[PDB]
Design an enzyme around this catalytic site. Structure first.
Site, PDB file in Angstrom:
ATOM      1  N   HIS A  77       0.793  -1.206   0.000  1.00  0.00           N
ATOM      2  CA  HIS A  77       0.000   0.000   0.000  1.00  0.00           C
ATOM      3  C   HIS A  77       0.827   1.258   0.000  1.00  0.00           C
ATOM      4  O   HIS A  77       0.425   2.247  -0.590  1.00  0.00           O
ATOM      5  CB  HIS A  77      -0.989  -0.090   1.146  1.00  0.00           C
ATOM      6  CG  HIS A  77      -2.104  -1.062   0.876  1.00  0.00           C
ATOM      7  ND1 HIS A  77      -3.378  -0.881   1.356  1.00  0.00           N
ATOM      8  CD2 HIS A  77      -2.130  -2.226   0.177  1.00  0.00           C
ATOM      9  CE1 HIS A  77      -4.169  -1.847   0.895  1.00  0.00           C
ATOM     10  NE2 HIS A  77      -3.444  -2.679   0.175  1.00  0.00           N
ATOM     11  N   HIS A 244      -0.457 -12.564  -2.935  1.00  0.00           N
ATOM     12  CA  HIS A 244      -1.481 -13.420  -2.367  1.00  0.00           C
ATOM     13  C   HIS A 244      -1.014 -14.880  -2.208  1.00  0.00           C
ATOM     14  O   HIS A 244      -1.773 -15.728  -1.846  1.00  0.00           O
ATOM     15  CB  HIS A 244      -2.773 -13.272  -3.154  1.00  0.00           C
ATOM     16  CG  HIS A 244      -3.381 -11.904  -3.015  1.00  0.00           C
ATOM     17  ND1 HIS A 244      -4.461 -11.480  -3.753  1.00  0.00           N
ATOM     18  CD2 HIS A 244      -2.977 -10.826  -2.275  1.00  0.00           C
ATOM     19  CE1 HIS A 244      -4.724 -10.213  -3.431  1.00  0.00           C
ATOM     20  NE2 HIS A 244      -3.850  -9.788  -2.520  1.00  0.00           N
TER      21      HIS A 244
HETATM   22  C1  HEM Z   1      -5.762  -6.321  -7.877  1.00  0.00           C
HETATM   23  C2  HEM Z   1      -4.870  -5.965  -6.950  1.00  0.00           C
HETATM   24  C3  HEM Z   1      -5.120  -6.295  -5.538  1.00  0.00           C
HETATM   25  C4  HEM Z   1      -6.277  -6.387  -4.847  1.00  0.00           C
HETATM   26  C5  HEM Z   1      -7.687  -6.050  -5.322  1.00  0.00           C
HETATM   27  C6  HEM Z   1      -5.940  -6.799  -3.500  1.00  0.00           C
HETATM   28  C7  HEM Z   1      -6.880  -6.964  -2.471  1.00  0.00           C
HETATM   29  C8  HEM Z   1      -6.576  -7.318  -1.166  1.00  0.00           C
HETATM   30  C9  HEM Z   1      -7.481  -7.319  -0.073  1.00  0.00           C
HETATM   31  C10 HEM Z   1      -8.968  -6.984  -0.170  1.00  0.00           C
HETATM   32  C11 HEM Z   1      -6.815  -7.786   0.998  1.00  0.00           C
HETATM   33  C12 HEM Z   1      -7.427  -8.041   2.368  1.00  0.00           C
HETATM   34  C13 HEM Z   1      -7.212  -6.903   3.320  1.00  0.00           C
HETATM   35  C14 HEM Z   1      -7.701  -7.380   4.677  1.00  0.00           C
HETATM   36  O1  HEM Z   1      -8.932  -7.625   4.772  1.00  0.00           O
HETATM   37  O2  HEM Z   1      -6.879  -7.528   5.651  1.00  0.00           O
HETATM   38  C15 HEM Z   1      -5.453  -8.027   0.597  1.00  0.00           C
HETATM   39  C16 HEM Z   1      -4.481  -8.572   1.380  1.00  0.00           C
HETATM   40  C17 HEM Z   1      -3.189  -8.723   0.967  1.00  0.00           C
HETATM   41  N1  HEM Z   1      -2.646  -8.325  -0.226  1.00  0.00           N
HETATM   42 FE1  HEM Z   1      -3.642  -7.869  -1.830  1.00  0.00          FE
HETATM   43  N2  HEM Z   1      -4.642  -7.001  -3.417  1.00  0.00           N
HETATM   44  C18 HEM Z   1      -4.069  -6.640  -4.590  1.00  0.00           C
HETATM   45  C19 HEM Z   1      -2.749  -6.671  -4.918  1.00  0.00           C
HETATM   46  C20 HEM Z   1      -1.737  -6.980  -4.044  1.00  0.00           C
HETATM   47  C21 HEM Z   1      -0.338  -6.911  -4.353  1.00  0.00           C
HETATM   48  C22 HEM Z   1       0.264  -6.335  -5.647  1.00  0.00           C
HETATM   49  C23 HEM Z   1       0.345  -7.361  -3.233  1.00  0.00           C
HETATM   50  C24 HEM Z   1       1.767  -7.446  -2.957  1.00  0.00           C
HETATM   51  C25 HEM Z   1       2.681  -7.661  -3.846  1.00  0.00           C
HETATM   52  C26 HEM Z   1      -0.657  -7.716  -2.243  1.00  0.00           C
HETATM   53  C27 HEM Z   1      -0.360  -8.388  -1.074  1.00  0.00           C
HETATM   54  C28 HEM Z   1      -1.335  -8.641  -0.129  1.00  0.00           C
HETATM   55  C29 HEM Z   1      -1.042  -9.348   1.111  1.00  0.00           C
HETATM   56  C30 HEM Z   1       0.259  -9.917   1.533  1.00  0.00           C
HETATM   57  C31 HEM Z   1      -2.203  -9.398   1.806  1.00  0.00           C
HETATM   58  C32 HEM Z   1      -2.388 -10.087   3.140  1.00  0.00           C
HETATM   59  C33 HEM Z   1      -2.423  -9.170   4.336  1.00  0.00           C
HETATM   60  C34 HEM Z   1      -2.443  -9.898   5.662  1.00  0.00           C
HETATM   61  O3  HEM Z   1      -2.023 -11.090   5.811  1.00  0.00           O
HETATM   62  O4  HEM Z   1      -2.868  -9.251   6.687  1.00  0.00           O
HETATM   63  N3  HEM Z   1      -1.888  -7.561  -2.808  1.00  0.00           N
HETATM   64  N4  HEM Z   1      -5.324  -7.708  -0.732  1.00  0.00           N
END
Ligand code: HEM
Ligand code: HEM
Ligand SMILES: [Cl-]
Ligand SMILES: [Cl-]
Ligand code: NA
Ligand code: NA
EC number: 1.11.1.21
Lengths: 713, 713
Positions: A77, A244
């Site tokens: 972010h 993810h």
């Molecule tokens: C289309 C692009 C993306 C969408 C729509 C998206 C959406 C989300 C959402 C909705 C969450 C859940 C937030 C929560 O409820 O705690 C999340 C978590 C996460 N995203 Fe994505 N994401 C995107 C791209 C990315 C990218 C580019 C990365 C990193 C390279 C990333 C890494 C993560 C990680 C590691 C989590 C887990 C957080 C945790 O374990 O607390 N995401 N993402």
């Protein structure tokens, strides 16, 4: 308290040019963050970060015992606000910790992540910035969980107040498209310079466009927004599937349980927000996005399981415990671990936007290749993570520390090393004399150097005269740059260069990049001479010439000036008034209001206008460096009216005779209208100011010539 | 473009603390206006001004061939925004040329007056500020028309952006009282700190209260608003009758003819506004207030005709050509000249507010004495005009040039001259040792010097430790100053002083004003020593002690601090949050956000709180100068909740055990809540910050000690 903004909501706002003053900065005026970071023991910081990963705090317990996923999200972010259109956003200023980003809905609970980092920040103090630390922590999270990163550079100095950025016009968080302030029009065309689909999101809606769970239509939003953040299809799939591979989302109960965001929370919340009434409000009960998805069987370890699941199951639409759209694997066993209860397991789940990587035909081919070739996936994700988190850091000369990758990447707009002696002061004097003897005019020389140097923007530290990219595609063909005139100037300069270089002994040579700037300096000196002033303009050699192959033509397109008030240029008709575009350009060039003022007045009389327009050329001695612009602008003997043909062009006529004296644009006449700009114009238009004008002009000229000169920093 | 203020309209705004940065200033960092002005040929400027009075410009023709009246009005509006409650407004920064004042309805067509002055401003450049020129122009107008002024001081430096001032909460120009944002409540009680009856007026409504033409009730508004500008009945009568000895009002046709104020006007208007469609739009046809009154038979010459007319006729209510209520002497011959047509004459006319001077019983007695004794009228008007136009200039040490009146006036809060050698470095060290040996504590010493120094306000440059007025009425009995503790400290310091002075030869002596400050410096040095650090706090002697007879007690009341967050003090319960009042106080003390932050954290641990409150005393080593406040405030091991008894006081308890650790106020905890202030607190609370904290504390301490020391400028 009624304010000026309330009474006159459309008057130009200059305060964006005087952000980041010495007043708001707690550090002393001589503080040099690069020098502080260079002495940091980065290895020690990284050992502390590794320890933190599994040191769970009871006020925000770690999922699976490991904060890594939370921290990767935090770092993604921080970097993920970046827009290629203006260079604004990104990780490079640590703006996540200020309004409004600290309180965007898509940043919920990242306030917790940042607070987990306070003990480390506090320990190392000024030697590591928040900006650097957020990124480093993401790197360490990856490394902790078994993923080898491509590298890391320090050097992002902290800032101390919010940046002024246009994030959209909506007045409701997360407003769906088609509202009174819609960021969409036409066939889902997102307004520049925006790079997110809804106010308070990073890129796209995880449920699908405007909440409609269609993975194919979601893919279109992903592609568009990621391209507006400088990522192509391969980088985009690698990033989303890479990210993810770790962690989980949080949606354990209804979102109505979640309270005020940080900037709205009570004072007792001490800088945190989104306090939840749902059960314990944290941990197993956490609510962040409202989705409840865990992607892999080993959420705290790098794996190839994301694409095994994506392709290995068929997907069914379902609802999280908060009511959000998400997907679950048809017929699957419960193989995914619970984050807190070792006795529970879950079926594989996915977001709509995860399914995009399979059901968009172009992403499917990439995803399938990464599924079959996991080493290609790992390398692509490493490279894209590095680009993501460094895209706004500027030239490689800014990169600090022991982990900087040696590989030079196309996206860095690389500049070749200089391997030879540089010209000295005697040489520079010889070259200036040759430039002035060639017949090149003041207007040609000033215009060409302006065109080369004024592509710089401080937002992402791209552009500037280093590289001599003005001679390459696409800069050589930009309308603002007057391609035919430019070609003739460059031809003459390249001959001067070749002759000088051919006469040298040893390996002394001058770059065309340097000569373009030195030639501009000669033009300014000649203009001062024309006005009867004896002026020497500073010049610092050391620029090098980049090749076409080192210059990504598509990525360069965003630097094209479609509005440049300093050349009285507008490429087309825009919604935003031209004076607003001027202040926007001044901000990208890192100019204050006084600097903007002096520079524009000087450029007008030097003949820097595009097309040799007379607009704003309020002097009878063109190509002489005087304060004529200001004196004549402020002469109450002249009355100004908009033209019949074009309401944005004005005629200045003698009040008594009716004779036509001048014509001007909005950019010209704003200096006689706006009460703060007119105050500045008055200083320069006073009878005691001719020398001050010259000296201040030379200073701001030189500042613009050196904007990208981080090799001198 | 949606902003942080849109999303979170009640968050604290710190940008008021970082106005007037070096970024927005066109002058060099070393520019010194006093040095420029001291070389101005003032006599030459006044000769050019004299000539201007009768040099009519066709775009705004002079009434009666003389701009004097217009310029007197201009200069009275420049000074007439002043409020005694906070010291804000006044002529002293030339703010009439910026928003919003440049566009207040009561300032209509003063844009024309300022424009007439550009050729002279231009000629003399940086040697005469706009701020000085506006007032000088008023004086020259007066002198040209036969009125002997009391004198003039230069030294008002120009500013380069709008001041942030609370002018009221109304969202409609000139809104009548009793609306949703009424500035009145109760029995016509005007809210502090306001000093005008409607938004966009200087003091009162010339037709009468909320447009009701009753001279008797108008007088009550006059009295109230003039008192809130620091003028008493005699000064008020002298000023109104003095001003309305000259010129005329403008109301030739309906007000609907008048267009957009300057901040709303088109760019072609080049900073001017109120363009009128009525006939020629100017001159004989001018419309400014909508009233059409000319007071005297000789509007371009000093006379006693205003009171001759006021008392010599009986008055009847009538309407101007714009429909405004005004008064005419129907029994009179047509004795008043027309402003443009030598063949026309008019009957005497008056405003409702002019008649107030005859039909209010207290004003009538003064008016009658001025009527019968016009030499007394002239002297009172001269004195009141000087006061009006100099009231916000600060100590007499700031007054520049050859026309400064020698007479010292009680309203100037005068400081006696120093006629003896000052203490040197060795003497200061001897005195510091003596103070510390007396038994006075770090808390006593720091509290007393803070109390003395922190009455300064930069708005009107009143207050500060010079004069030792803390020992006099009323300061010695202000609740914030802890009158019984203060008496004990002062007794001890006076004994030290007496001893030291008695031992000297050669006339050397130390003032109590100096010793109070020096003793505070000793307290800070002892506190640093308590923390294991040797430092020397800078100290500059040369303050002098004022007497009670040289101290107007009534006028001193507005300097009483009823909120001082730096002593965790609030006199009563206010509508405005305490943290807002802290930022307001910081602004008055000329502090940036970093300086406010350092200073408050240090004061807390030094024992500067009123009543020795523990609120915000987040240290176990009180009276040692450490960064404990910030370290403890930022400790996530402590959880904060508002108390049941008082929602504005908070308990900090250990998060694991529930043990009570600290209590704090809003003023304390805002530094852990507000995202910009918390960023600052982090710098000072980091493990590398002990040295920086102490250095920056000593610097800001010294800055506050020297706020009124324009004798050193
Ligand atoms: C289309 C692009 C993306 C969408 C729509 C998206 C959406 C989300 C959402 C909705 C969450 C859940 C937030 C929560 O409820 O705690 C999340 C978590 C996460 N995203 Fe994505 N994401 C995107 C791209 C990315 C990218 C580019 C990365 C990193 C390279 C990333 C890494 C993560 C990680 C590691 C989590 C887990 C957080 C945790 O374990 O607390 N995401 N993402
Ligand atoms: C109760 C206080 C006062 C009220 C309500 C008041 C009201 C007014 C109004 C309505 C005008 C007409 C503006 C126009 O239409 O052009 C005006 C003119 C003027 N006022 Fe006052 N005034 C006040 C106090 C003062 C004071 C204190 C002075 C200066 C010592 C001053 C000096 C003048 C002068 C010289 C003009 C004539 C302007 C010209 O010739 O263009 N007034 N005043
Ligand atoms: Cl930004
Ligand atoms: Cl002010
Ligand atoms: Na950026
Ligand atoms: Na003031």
């Amino acid at each position: 308290g009624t304010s000026n903004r309330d009474w006159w909501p459309n008057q130009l706002d200059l305060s964006i040019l005087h952000r980041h003053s010495s007043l708001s900065d707690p550090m002393g005026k001589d503080f040099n963050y690069a020098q502080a970071f260079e002495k940091l023991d980065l290895a020690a910081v990284k050992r502390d970060l590794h320890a933190l990963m599994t040191t769970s705090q009871d006020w925000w317990p770690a999922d699976f015992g490991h904060y890594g996923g939370l921290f990767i999200r935090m770092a993604w972010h921080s970097a993920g606000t970046y827009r290629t259109a203006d260079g604004r956003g990104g990780a490079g200023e640590g703006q996540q910790r200020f309004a409004p980003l600290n309180s965007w809905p898509n940043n919920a609970n990242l306030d917790k992540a940042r607070r987990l980092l306070w003990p480390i920040k506090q320990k190392y103090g000024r030697a590591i910035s928040w900006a650097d630390l957020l990124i480093l922590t993401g790197n360490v999270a990856l490394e902790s969980m078994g993923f080898k990163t491509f590298g890391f550079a320090g050097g992002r100095a902290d800032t101390w107040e919010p940046e002024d950025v246009y994030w959209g016009s909506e007045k409701i968080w997360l407003e769906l498209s088609g509202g009174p302030n819609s960021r969409y029009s036409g066939d889902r065309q997102l307004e520049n310079p925006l790079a997110a689909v809804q106010m308070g999101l990073i890129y796209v809606n995880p449920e699908g466009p405007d909440g409609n769970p269609d993975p194919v239509a979601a893919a279109r939003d992903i592609r568009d927004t990621f391209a507006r953040m400088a990522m192509n299809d391969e980088e985009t799939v690698a990033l989303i599937a890479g990210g993810h591979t770790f962690g989980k989302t949080h949606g354990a109960g209804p979102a109505s349980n979640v309270g005020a965001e940080p900037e709205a929370a009570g004072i007792e919340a001490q800088g945190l927000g989104w306090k939840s009434a749902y059960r314990t409000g944290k941990g197993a009960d956490a609510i962040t996005s409202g989705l409840e998805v865990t992607w892999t069987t080993t959420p705290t370890q790098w794996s190839h399981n994301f694409f095994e699941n994506l392709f290995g199951y068929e997907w069914e639409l379902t609802k999280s415990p908060a009511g959000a759209h998400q997907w679950v694997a048809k017929g699957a066993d419960a193989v995914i671990p619970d984050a807190f209860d070792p006795s529970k397991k879950h079926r594989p789940t996915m977001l709509t936007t995860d399914l995009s990587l399979r059901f968009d035909p172009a992403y499917e081919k990439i995803s399938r290749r990464f599924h079959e070739n996991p080493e290609q996936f790992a390398d692509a994700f490493a490279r894209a993570w590095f680009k993501l988190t460094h895209r706004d850091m500027g030239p490689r000369a800014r990169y600090l520390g022991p982990e900087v990758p040696a590989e030079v990447l196309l996206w860095q707009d690389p500049i070749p090393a200089v391997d030879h002696p540089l010209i000295d002061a005697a040489d520079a004097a010889e070259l200036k004399a040759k430039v002035l003897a060639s017949g090149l005019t003041v207007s040609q020389l000033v215009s060409t150097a302006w065109a080369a140097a004024s592509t710089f923007r401080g937002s992402d530290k791209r552009g500037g005269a280093n590289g001599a990219r003005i001679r390459l595609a696409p800069q050589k063909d930009w309308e603002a740059n007057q391609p035919e005139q430019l070609a003739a100037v460059l031809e003459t300069l390249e001959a001067i260069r070749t002759a000088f270089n051919g006469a040298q002994r040893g390996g002394k040579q001058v770059s065309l990049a340097d000569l373009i700037v030195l030639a501009g300096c000669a033009g300014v000196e000649q203009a001062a001479k024309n006005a009867g002033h004896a002026v020497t303009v500073p010049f610092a050699p050391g620029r090098a010439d980049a090749s076409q192959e080192q210059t990504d033509v598509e990525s360069m397109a965003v630097l094209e000036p479609v509005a440049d008030g300093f050349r009285n240029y507008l490429k087309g008709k825009y919604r935003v008034p031209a004076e607003v575009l001027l202040v926007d350009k001044a901000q990208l060039l890192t100019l204050s209001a006084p600097e903007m003022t002096v520079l524009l007045g000087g450029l007008r009389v030097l003949g820097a206008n595009v097309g040799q327009s007379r607009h704003g050329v309020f002097t009878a001695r063109e190509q002489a460096l005087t304060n004529d612009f200001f004196v004549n602008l402020l002469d109450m003997g002249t009355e100004w009216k908009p033209t019949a043909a074009d309401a944005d062009v004005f005629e200045g006529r003698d009040r008594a005779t009716g004779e036509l004296k001048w014509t001007g644009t909005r950019v010209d006449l704003v200096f006689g209208s706006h009460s703060q700009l007119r105050a500045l114009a008055e200083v320069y238009g006073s009878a005691d100011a001719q020398e001050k004008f010259v000296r201040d002009f030379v200073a701001v000229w030189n500042k613009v010539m050196n904007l990208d000169r981080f090799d001198l920093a």
